[PDB]
Design a protein around this ligand. Structure first.
Ligand SMILES: [Mg+2]
Ligand SMILES: [Mg+2]
Ligand SMILES: [Mg+2]
Ligand SMILES: [Sr+2]
Ligand SMILES: [Sr+2]
Ligand SMILES: [Sr+2]
Ligand SMILES: [Sr+2]
Ligand SMILES: [Sr+2]
Ligand SMILES: [Sr+2]
Ligand SMILES: [Sr+2]
Ligand SMILES: [Sr+2]
Ligand SMILES: [Sr+2]
Ligand SMILES: [Sr+2]
Ligand SMILES: [Sr+2]
Ligand SMILES: [Sr+2]
Ligand SMILES: [Sr+2]
Ligand SMILES: [Sr+2]
Ligand SMILES: [Sr+2]
Ligand SMILES: [Sr+2]
Ligand SMILES: [Sr+2]
Ligand SMILES: [Sr+2]
Ligand SMILES: [Sr+2]
Ligand SMILES: [Sr+2]
Ligand SMILES: [Sr+2]
Ligand SMILES: [Sr+2]
Ligand SMILES: [Sr+2]
Ligand SMILES: [Sr+2]
Ligand SMILES: [Sr+2]
Ligand SMILES: [Sr+2]
Ligand SMILES: [Sr+2]
Ligand SMILES: [Sr+2]
Ligand SMILES: [Sr+2]
Ligand SMILES: [Sr+2]
Ligand SMILES: [Sr+2]
Ligand SMILES: [Sr+2]
Ligand SMILES: [Sr+2]
Ligand SMILES: [Sr+2]
Ligand SMILES: [Sr+2]
Ligand SMILES: [Sr+2]
Ligand SMILES: [Sr+2]
Ligand SMILES: [Sr+2]
Ligand SMILES: [Sr+2]
Ligand SMILES: [Sr+2]
Ligand SMILES: [Sr+2]
Ligand SMILES: [Sr+2]
Ligand SMILES: [Sr+2]
Ligand SMILES: [Sr+2]
Ligand SMILES: [Sr+2]
Length: 81
RNA sequence: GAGUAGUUCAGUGGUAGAACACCACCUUGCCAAGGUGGGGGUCGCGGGUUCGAAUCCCGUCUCGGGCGAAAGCCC
RNA sequence: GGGUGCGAUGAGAAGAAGAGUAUUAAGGAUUUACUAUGAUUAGCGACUCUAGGAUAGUGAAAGCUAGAGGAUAGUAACCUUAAGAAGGCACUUCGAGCACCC
């Protein structure tokens, strides 16, 4: 949901920073794009599903980053609430 | 008048010079820079002169310009 | 504010490598290569020898090719001391702008 990402209080942008955020489990929701490379997505959805956190899948990664406030797009973004 | 190494240029009768570019070592994380080494050239082509032609001479191919009715001639 | 290019498939910054390396100085050492140079007189032109080539003139000996052998430095290669860097990719944290133009 692009709506939940555009809103929310505490978010984090980028795959590396989202997995690093998963390494402390201070994240409430995880939003990942489908059109992104699976080599980069599987790595985060594995740990996300392992932690027991909810895993969402969205269409485009461009509109994702657009919803995050960034101006280039993001492969994976986590709401750290 | 221009034609010379991959490129940009020199070479005003003595077997072809430099810069940049290429290769090799330095140099195993990968490039760049650098510092040392080497390789490469029917001098557009063919004759002529000469011991020796990139250089002078004749012919000829390509390019730019000029003169001319044209053929041709000149730079 | 504007025009491009690039950026979470990581802008940018710092750290870490790079490295006590390249290298500049002060020495030690006297072999390998590269480069420069070879009395006077002829001569445009000479380190010496050899083998081909080729030779008009000048010369004791000529310009090409292929080898081999000599000293003087100037060099890079090897040691010691004191100094001694560096750009980008990859690495590690931080994560949103940076470069060119008016
Ligand atoms: Mg120290
Ligand atoms: Mg020390
Ligand atoms: Mg010395
Ligand atoms: Sr002429
Ligand atoms: Sr001519
Ligand atoms: Sr040529
Ligand atoms: Sr000329
Ligand atoms: Sr020569
Ligand atoms: Sr070579
Ligand atoms: Sr090494
Ligand atoms: Sr180099
Ligand atoms: Sr060189
Ligand atoms: Sr060569
Ligand atoms: Sr050479
Ligand atoms: Sr030649
Ligand atoms: Sr000609
Ligand atoms: Sr000829
Ligand atoms: Sr002829
Ligand atoms: Sr002849
Ligand atoms: Sr001619
Ligand atoms: Sr004529
Ligand atoms: Sr003729
Ligand atoms: Sr013409
Ligand atoms: Sr004409
Ligand atoms: Sr005319
Ligand atoms: Sr002439
Ligand atoms: Sr602007
Ligand atoms: Sr812009
Ligand atoms: Sr574009
Ligand atoms: Sr950076
Ligand atoms: Sr840095
Ligand atoms: Sr440092
Ligand atoms: Sr010194
Ligand atoms: Sr000495
Ligand atoms: Sr020795
Ligand atoms: Sr003399
Ligand atoms: Sr002399
Ligand atoms: Sr000489
Ligand atoms: Sr000789
Ligand atoms: Sr010598
Ligand atoms: Sr002989
Ligand atoms: Sr003779
Ligand atoms: Sr004689
Ligand atoms: Sr020789
Ligand atoms: Sr020496
Ligand atoms: Sr040293
Ligand atoms: Sr921007
Ligand atoms: Sr203006």
């Amino acid at each position: 949901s692009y709506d939940k990402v555009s809103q929310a209080k505490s978010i984090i942008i980028g795959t590396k920073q989202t997995v690093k955020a998963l390494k402390r489990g201070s994240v409430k929701e995880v939003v990942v794009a489908k059109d992104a490379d699976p080599i980069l997505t599987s790595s985060v959805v594995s740990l996300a599903e392992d932690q027991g956190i909810s895993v969402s899948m969205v269409e485009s990664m461009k509109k994702l980053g657009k919803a995050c406030g960034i101006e280039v797009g993001a492969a994976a973004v986590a709401i750290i609430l």
